[PDB]
């Protein structure tokens, strides 16, 4: 349904894509030959499948009181992890950014 | 569990270079500001002095300090180490991300698994094991009982992957009333009533593979720093009452590792 550009230090690295059944997929770009999105996702493999929201991307979301501030500001479901990541995706910890496809 | 750090804000901020002051922003900041919590007392002053104690024992600690917020209370700041130069970033990943856990399961791990993450991903694991030993002893001595998986991170800097500079180091024991544990993640299956042999024999020798000379030297460093730690706490911005709690816990933890025998 929803797909998103994942970039590393501004360079587009791949697509985080949400599939039906609550599963997710990350696919690297051929053209991308820079540092991995995560040390758990080396460029060695180009496709990564997940039965739940991938822990790397879940680890970019806010916690505690700052999560409640996010849910006070946006009309978003408490567990829409992908939607929340799109909301904060322009600036998160580390070198990765996330921008929604259309 | 009820975590002290969950009830405190982490505000993005820019340093206005021409003045000596911070501007809070929603995005695109280079500093984090942590103001007072309404749930737990003195968290900014507690974090500021704890991070300074860590620096005094030789852990890698970024720029940090205190500033006055609008309401006369003190607010803590830290210079982000994933932000450098002009709009440049460094890769940074916490151990929940690296071990496949999430925010809900960030306590569902162990110090043994923390070691395994370092062995898998760090450029020089044996060097980072020395750092982890010092960090774990430090957190035990200053009552930091909230080192869960998201409080360990690996940074990629200068093409080397290592344990990141310190962040979020706090004496969470004195900040909260009915403290449940000493370690957030078990060591040898233990989160309370840890002993000297847990740290110096099982942890340092069996699990980290450190040589006895290296262990002895690190212990001596801690012995030597206690007078300066006592002095720094006395001069901190903690209240007198919170200073006494901090010193009393430090002495108890020191005594438990036979520092004064
Ligand atoms: Na009391």
> Is B140:B190 a contact under the CB 8 Å cutoff?
no
Ranges of each domain in chain A: 3-100
Q: What is the CATH number of the domain that holds B125?
A: 1.10.1070.20
Question: Does A95 sit within 8 Å of B82, measured CB to CB?
Answer: yes
- Sort out which chain A residues have CB atoms less than 8 A from B29's CB and list them: 91
Distance of CA A78 to the CA centre of its chain: 17
Domain that holds residue B209: 96-260
Question: Does A65 sit within 8 Å of B150, measured CB to CB?
Answer: no
Interface residue ranges in chain B relative to chain A, Cβ cutoff 8 Å:
3, 5-10, 12, 27-29, 82, 88-94, 96-98, 100-103, 121, 150, 154, 156, 161
Q: Which of B130, B102, B98 is nearest to B113 (CA)?
A: B98
Measured in Å, residue B140 CA sits from the centre of ligand 1 at 21
Measured in Å, residue B51 CA sits from the centre of ligand 1 at 23
Measured in Å, residue A46 CA sits from the centre of ligand 1 at 56
- Sort out which chain B residues have CB atoms less than 8 A from A8's CB and list them: 91
Q: Distance (Å) from the C-alpha of residue B233 to the closest C-alpha of chain A?
A: 28
Residue in B closest to A61 by C-alpha: B103
- Sort out which chain B residues have CB atoms less than 8 A from A82's CB and list them: none
Q: How far apart are CA B113 and CA B129, in angstroms?
A: 13
Partner residue facing B82 (CB), from A35, A90, A94: A94
Indicate the DSSP class of residue B180.
-
Distance of CA A50 to the CA centre of its chain: 12
Residue in A closest to B26 by C-alpha: A91
Quick one: three-class SS letters along chain B? CCCCHHHCCCEEEEEECCCCEEEEECCCCCEEEECCCCCCCCHHHHHHHHHHHHHHCCCCCCCEEEEECCCCCEEEEEECCCEECCCEECEEEEHHHHHCCCCCCCCCCCHHHHHHHHHHHCCCHHHHHHHHHHHHHHHHHCCCCCCCHHHCEEEEECCEEEECCCCCCCCHHHHCCCCCCCCCCCECCECCCCCHHHHHHHHHHHHCCCCHHHHHHHHHHHHHHHHHHHHHHHCCCCCHHHHHHHHHHHHHHHHHCCCCC
Q: How far apart are CA B239 and CA B1, in angstroms?
A: 27
Q: Edge-to-edge, what's the strand order for the sheet holding A47-50?
A: A47-50, A24-28, A11-18, A3-8, A96-100
Question: Does B150 sit within 8 Å of A59, measured CB to CB?
Answer: yes
Look at residue B22 and give its three-state secondary structure: strand
Q: Please give the resolution of this entry in Å, rounded to 1 decimal.
A: 1.8
Q: Distance (Å) from the C-alpha of residue B184 to the closest C-alpha of chain A?
A: 17
């Amino acid at each position: 349904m929803r797909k998103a550009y994942v970039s590393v230090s501004g360079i587009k690295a791949g697509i985080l894509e949400e599939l039906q059944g609550g599963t997710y997929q990350f696919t690297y770009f051929e053209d991308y030959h820079g540092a991995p999105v995560s040390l758990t996702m080396p460029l060695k493999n180009k496709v990564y499948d997940f039965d739940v929201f991938p822990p790397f991307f879940e680890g970019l979301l806010p916690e505690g009181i700052m999560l409640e501030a996010l849910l006070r500001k946006y009309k978003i479901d408490k567990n829409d992890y992908f939607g929340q990541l799109i909301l904060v995706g322009q600036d998160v910890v580390g070198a990765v950014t996330i921008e929604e496809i259309r | 569990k009820m975590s002290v750090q969950g009830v405190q804000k982490k505000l993005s901020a820019k340093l206005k270079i021409k003045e000596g002051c911070f501007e809070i922003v929603d995005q695109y900041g280079q500093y984090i500001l942590k103001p007072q919590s309404d749930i737990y007392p003195e968290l900014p002053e507690n974090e500021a002095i704890t991070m300074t104690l860590a620096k005094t024992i030789g852990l890698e600690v970024p720029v940090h300090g205190l500033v006055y917020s609008k309401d006369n209370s003190l607010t803590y700041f830290i210079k982000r180490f994933d932000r450098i130069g002009h709009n440049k970033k460094l890769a940074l990943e916490d151990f929940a991300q690296l071990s496949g856990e999430d925010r809900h399961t960030k306590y569902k791990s162990s110090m043994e698994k923390v070691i395994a993450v370092i062995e898998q991903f760090c450029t020089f694991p044996k060097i980072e094991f020395v750092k982890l030993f010092k960090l774990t002893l430090f957190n035990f001595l200053v009552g930091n009982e909230d080192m869960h998986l998201k409080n360990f991170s690996l940074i990629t800097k200068d093409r080397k992957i290592s344990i990141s500079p310190a962040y979020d180091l706090l004496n969470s024991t004195i900040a909260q009333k009915n403290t449940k544990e000493e370690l957030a993640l078990p060591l040898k299956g233990k989160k309370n009533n840890l002993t000297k042999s847990d740290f110096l024999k099982y942890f340092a020798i069996e699990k980290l593979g450190l040589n006895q000379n290296v262990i002895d030297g690190i212990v001596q460093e801690f012995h030597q720093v206690i007078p300066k730690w006592q002095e720094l706490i006395g001069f901190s911005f903690l209240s007198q009452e919170m200073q006494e709690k901090y010193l009393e816990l430090l002495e108890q933890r020191c005594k438990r590792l036979n520092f004064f025998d």
